[PDB]
Amino acid sequence: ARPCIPKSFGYSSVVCVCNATYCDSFDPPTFPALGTFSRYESTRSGRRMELSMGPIQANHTGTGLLLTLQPEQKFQKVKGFGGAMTDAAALNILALSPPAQNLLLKSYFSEEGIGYNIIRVPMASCDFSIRTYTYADTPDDFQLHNFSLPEEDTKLKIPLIHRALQLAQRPVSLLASPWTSPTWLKTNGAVNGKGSLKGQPGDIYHQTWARYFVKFLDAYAEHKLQFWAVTAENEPSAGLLSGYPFQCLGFTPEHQRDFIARDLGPTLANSTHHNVRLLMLDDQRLLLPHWAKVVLTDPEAAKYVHGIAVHWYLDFAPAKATLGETHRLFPNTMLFASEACVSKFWEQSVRLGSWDRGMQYSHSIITNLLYHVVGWTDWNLALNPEGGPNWVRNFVDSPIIVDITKDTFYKQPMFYHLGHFSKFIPEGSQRVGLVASQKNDLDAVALMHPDGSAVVVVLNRSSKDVPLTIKDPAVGFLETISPGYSIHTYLWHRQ
Ligand SMILES: *[C@@H]1O[C@H](CO)[C@@H](O[C@@H]2O[C@H](CO)[C@@H](O)[C@H](O)[C@H]2NC(C)=O)[C@H](O)[C@H]1NC(C)=O
Ligand SMILES: *[C@@H]1O[C@H](CO)[C@@H](O)[C@H](O)[C@H]1NC(C)=O
Ligand SMILES: *[C@@H]1O[C@H](CO)[C@@H](O)[C@H](O)[C@H]1NC(C)=O
Ligand SMILES: *[C@H]1[C@H](N)[C@H](CO)[C@H](O)[C@H](O)[C@H]1O
């Protein structure tokens, strides 16, 4: 283990400074002995996933807050956690010296880091690209004879994905999403702005676009990468908006329904990539449950849809009415958060050491977990201090900020807030009930690991310390305190 090297940039908390020869890391995982619990703590004051251990007490008295585990109240199984290998992320990582690149990838993907097991891969260019390109820019190439991967794939994204998978002990799942089709498949003949596919589902435009998904999967498979899932389109509602400034492809829910049923479903099912799962929506949860009803009430579409992908950008938060109602209507269709991102209109894109932006991530993950969501995918894995590069200056924050001039990278509070979940909630973990004895300002969630062991995350977004006890009837009582502006993860064996 190496501790955080803290640095202040004058905001509420510190970043952890890494370079070619030093980065903060964990010792190999270890389980706490029966009758004991592990505690990982991060605080605004500067603690970064610090490990301590306490006893599980046989009984408890007091009127203080009690959180009772309900281990027989069983909910969703977790797919996992990760982020996006954009052109911007890969260009930033590969601008560091080889040893600093390795410590950055280890921070995310190693058991000595925070154990990411998902990577979202854009299909060609998005706003976090330094140019607009698709895989098939030769006009009217319906047979896709000029389909090919540019250097952004073969020199930046694919080599970093291979290195990520080599560092991971957990199996990593790849998720692919397109922003735009070739312009010659679109009504507006442009990568951006208001525009859909030409014609109608079933026709040559729609069959070509479905075949483009298979050519992408074919080209990645030639580079020995296989996908867990693809989304039907990144943010289909964006391409319905006049002057939408970057790469988009408009679909109404009806258009998405018919494209999946007539073209994408059958084309993927008849390919060598038929095991790849399809997620629908990949957009703001405010479009639910309407979008799920339109697509999934058509059995010709539903038979091809594994899941619903949601974005957090416009959450701010009717989770019950959107995520909850959707689960109720379609309980066997998983909900997956495919894009989360932070910033206030009066704040810069990157705020080095923002505890507030950390708290937004952990709060979002807890709310999602409490409303059936199985997985949570950050946006850019890494950005520069301006929040780029980005061909349209749509600059945002990232858990890791690379300073190429200093051969340095900064781990933001967001990285640690994500880590409190990603490191301690492996694939197959199941959310279980956790009931509070009184109204409280805390956010908490409980899950059980595949092996039966318990995990609880407790976030305190208030300034006040909150004494609390966790009751697990199988083992006893965890007496602890949630300090103001802290996040804790608690682990214990149940037998
Ligand atoms: C990379 O970061 C490490 C850790 O902050 C730097 O090593 C420290 O350097 C300072 C100043 O020379 C020493 O006082 C510390 O004792 C060092 N710590 C360790 C663990 O070695 C290192 O200098 C940085 N590298 C560069 C190129 O700036
Ligand atoms: C399209 O493909 C043909 C045949 O392989 C090739 O000769 C030509 O250079 C390609 N066009 C572009 C723009 O790459
Ligand atoms: C499905 O795949 C088979 C075998 O590759 C092929 O012969 C057939 O034409 C395909 N069907 C359609 C409708 O594309
Ligand atoms: C989701 C989100 N708006 C981020 C913001 O950084 C980015 O624009 C993605 O392209 C969007 O899909």
Fold match flag (5-30+78-429 vs 35-77+430-495) = no
Backbone CA torsion sign across 129, 105, 386, 249: positive
- CA dist 430 and 374 (Å) reads 9
Instruction: Give the burial class of 352: count Cβ atoms within 10 A of its Cβ; 0-12 exposed, 13-18 middle, 19 or more buried.
Output: buried
What class has domain 5-30+78-429?
Answer: alpha beta
How far does the centroid of ligand 1 lie from the alpha carbon of residue 29, in Å?
A: 26
Query: 474: which residues sit within 8 A by CB, 6+ positions away?
Result: 71, 494, 495
With a 6 Å cutoff on the Cβ, whether 235 touches ligand 4 is: yes
Report yes or no: 211 and 144 within 8 Å, Cβ to Cβ.
yes
Please count the other Cβ atoms lying within 10 Å of the Cβ belonging to residue 377. 24
What's the CATH number for 35-77+430-495? 2.60.40.1180
Backbone CA torsion sign across 357, 435, 471, 77: negative
How far does the centroid of ligand 1 lie from the alpha carbon of residue 108, in Å?
A: 22
Report yes or no: 428 and 78 within 8 Å, Cβ to Cβ.
yes
- The backbone region for 262, taken as left when phi is positive above 0, alpha when psi lies in -120 to 50, beta otherwise, is alpha
Residues with a CB atom less than 6 Å from ligand 2:
138, 145-146
Q: What single letter denotes the amino acid at residue 211? A: R
Ligand nearest the Cα atom of residue 139:
2
- Deposited experimental method: X-ray
Closest-CA residue, ligand 4 atom 1, reads 339
Question: For the packed helices 413-422 and 355-369, what is the interaxial angle rounded to 10 degrees?
Answer: 30
Q: Is 347 among the residues known to form the active site?
A: no
The residue among 101, 68, 238, 265 whose CA lies nearest residue 167 is: 101
Domain ranges of the chain: 5-30+78-429, 35-77+430-495
Q: What is the CA radius of gyration of the chain?
A: 23
- CA dist 418 and 342 (Å) reads 13
The residue among 180, 280, 189 whose CA lies nearest residue 230 is: 280
Per the listing, tokens 């038979």 go with 303
Q: Is 112 among the residues known to form the active site?
A: no
